[PDB]
Amino acid sequence: RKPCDTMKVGGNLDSKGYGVATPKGSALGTPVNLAVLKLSEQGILDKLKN
């Protein structure tokens, strides 16, 4: 972002990660996770990241 006056140095310090939130015992959680894995293997997450 402007004024483009910062930069990121160093590697990641811990293993953090975000995921799709669903209630416990939900029936749609397994097809949602299959869709997440399908979008991850297709690389469309990296496309939206770019």
- In the chain the first and final C-alpha atoms are separated, in Å, by 14
Residue from 1, 2, 12, 27 in contact with other proteins (CB under 8 A): 12
HSE value, Cβ hemisphere, 13 Å, CA-based, for 28: 5
- Residue 41 structure tokens: 């293997």
Q: Which of 1, 2, 16, 27 binds other proteins (CB under 8 A)?
A: 16
Q: Which of 1, 2, 27, 38 binds other proteins (CB under 8 A)?
A: 38
Q: Is residue 47 near other proteins by the rule CB under 8 A?
A: yes
Whether 35 and 45 have beta carbons less than 8 Å apart is answered as no
Contacting positions for other proteins (CB under 8 A): 5-26, 28-29, 32-34, 36-47, 49-50
